[PDB]
């Protein structure tokens, strides 16, 4: 039969009040002849009705795909409430249910360190600025870079990695022209996480 997948919101969306965290329920392998797909949502057991459901969409393997999107309350997601998507077809009683929630467990605050380029990289045209982020729980987290009050784009961040003590760590690498680093520019690694004061902290880095 069909398959259902339930996806959490983005960490950044849950941590900033101004953004719109959403839980997404995706049904694949729907058949043309299947009666209209229906979605019931529950939040900690209670049915709710603000979900937006998109009309079904043909995939190339001759199946259909259906998505229902539930806007969630930041506080609720962070409080560890359980979102349940229940999926069925208009007429038949059979249904499929899926449940998701934030990771359970004592949250830990991330320590954020900045590392300048290795002296050995200094001979190249571009250098790597490193941001180590360690000791955090849960793994849901967001890392960004900026400079001169404007976002930097040329960075990549590793996935969270599980440490011995059950916390997570990761690295972020911002690549910049040597000429920009030694002119004395300040670069900032920004980290967003539920255990940080105001869900936010920032650590800066320039040539010493």
Numbering used by the authors: 237 to 444
From the publication, what sentences describe this entry?
Human IgG4, normally the least abundant of the four subclasses of IgG in serum, displays a number of unique biological properties. It can undergo heavy-chain exchange, also known as Fab-arm exchange, leading to the formation of monovalent but bispecific antibodies, and it interacts poorly with FcγRII and FcγRIII, and complement. These structures reveal conformational variability at the CH3–CH3 interface that may promote Fab-arm exchange, and a unique conformation for the FG loop in the CH2 domain that would explain the poor FcγRII, FcγRIII and C1q binding properties of IgG4 compared with IgG1 and -3.
We report here the crystal structures of IgG4-Fc obtained from papain digestion of IgG4 from patient sera (sdFc), and recombinant IgG4-Fc (rFc), both at substantially higher resolution (2.35 Å and 1.9 Å, respectively) than the previous Fc study. The sdFc structure was solved using the previously characterised Rea IgG4 myeloma protein. The Rea IgG4 oligosaccharide is a 70% G(0) glycoform that was later enzymatically galactosylated to yield a 100% G(2) glycoform. In both chains, a galactose residue attached to the α(1–6) branch forms hydrogen bonds with surrounding protein residues, but the α(1–3) branch galactose residue was disordered. A complex biantennary core was modelled in both structures, and with the exception of chain B of the sdFc structure, a fucose residue, attached to the first N-acetylglucosamine residue covalently bound to Asn297, was also built. In conformation 1, found in the A chains of both rFc and sdFc, as well as the low-resolution Fc structure, the Arg409 guanidinium group is oriented towards Asp399′ (of the other H chain), forming an electrostatic interaction. In the rFc structure, three conserved water molecules (W1–W3) are present at the CH3–CH3 interface, while in the sdFc structure, two conserved water molecules (W3–W4) are present, and the hydrogen bond network is comparable to that found in IgG1. On the other hand, in chain B of the sdFc structure, B-factors for residues at the CH3 domain surface, close to the CH3–CH3 interface, are considerably higher than those for the rest of the domain. The Ser400′ side chain points away from Asn390, its hydrogen bonding partner, and other interface residues, including Arg409, are partially disordered. Intriguingly, the high B-factors for residues at the CH3 domain surface, and partial disorder at the CH3 interface in chain B of the sdFc structure, may represent the transition of Arg409 between the two conformations, or may even provide an early snapshot of the dissociation process itself.
